Amino acid sequence: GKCKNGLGEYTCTSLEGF
């Protein structure tokens, strides 16, 4: 799930480390 038009997810970015 991604935040496209809205802000409905708990987080909108993916964790990829440093």
Add this chain to the structure above:
Amino acid sequence: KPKLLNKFDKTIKAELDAAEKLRKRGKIEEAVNAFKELVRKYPQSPRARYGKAQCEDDLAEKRRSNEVLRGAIETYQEVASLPDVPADLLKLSLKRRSDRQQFLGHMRGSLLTLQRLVQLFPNDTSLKNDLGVGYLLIGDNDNAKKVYEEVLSVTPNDGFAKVHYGFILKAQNKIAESIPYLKEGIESGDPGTDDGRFYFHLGDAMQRVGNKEAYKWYELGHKRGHFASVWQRSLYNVNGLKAQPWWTPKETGYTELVKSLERNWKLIRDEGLAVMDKAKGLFLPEDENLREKGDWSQFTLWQQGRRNENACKGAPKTCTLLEKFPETTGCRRGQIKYSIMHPGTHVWPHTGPTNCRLRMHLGLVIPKEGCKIRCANETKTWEEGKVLIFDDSFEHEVWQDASSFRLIFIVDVWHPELTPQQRRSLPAI
């Protein structure tokens, strides 16, 4: 406080403290070899093994190295496998392990660690809440909901569980049910409840049920640093960017892109109509629970700055035209997409996630009456062949009460004041 030393570790406390001093002093290289010597000499020592892990953790920060951090994550686990590990040290080591796994994106591995922590400490309510976050981070709202129900059945006044339970309920469109959980949880002031996401969704839940107190929560969230303003409530922001609900083409500086869209609008329209007529499955119903009612679907050509190759087979000329404009094709915090809305459609007042993009709307098929978009305190209409530009990090709202379909083309651009460095480095949204 914490009791970190077991019986044997108390007997070697001078060696352990000397190694730890080197770490606190920032002599990370010497500290690693100091703790390596202790692990070699006392291979069962939990404090020595934790020291080794913290040194690797610090070294990974110093080098910005994912591989070094993966080593630390393994060592934090090794601590837990040692005999006679004090409870405080076991919890600390596994908690940091899960935190660093989440940092690397090992969400499944983090979840396993969190589950172990709950099994090892069945009475620690905070570890259950952390497990619920693990589920929320991997998109498992069903298991996350069960975790917080388990917390609330034992400690019903836990504010952390309340806001996260309320967040889940709101996400499931249980709007009325979510409001007291979000509200009481924020009012609890418990650690972790002072968070912009919960002010965001409490105010929006209230807006959807007609509770006029919604903007009181937006004002408090603004006063507490979560929102740039009561109107602009995006949560992924670069501070200081010019904040304006409506923008002219000239103000954005993307006048070449706007000229191309307006000069070439009919080819964009025609490919959209062809997809509606011959491949309408490429239009996907809006799926962020933003509709009060009606029908709204989108056909996406670019998202997160990535071209959808199959989708561009459906609008090859439009994709070719847009490929000349990296200000939109490389906007990793926006999309390029057709957007179709039919009569009887009302889109709830809402805000986008980030202030780092501006949103262009190119009118393609606009009924003469019935369609409008409000951004902040100003409502406007589309025109066929013409571009509107608004900052969708401001609250905006859409109505479609025409007698036929309304088709537009949505083109997100980087906020013009973001440097090339920021545009390359910002995480995609």
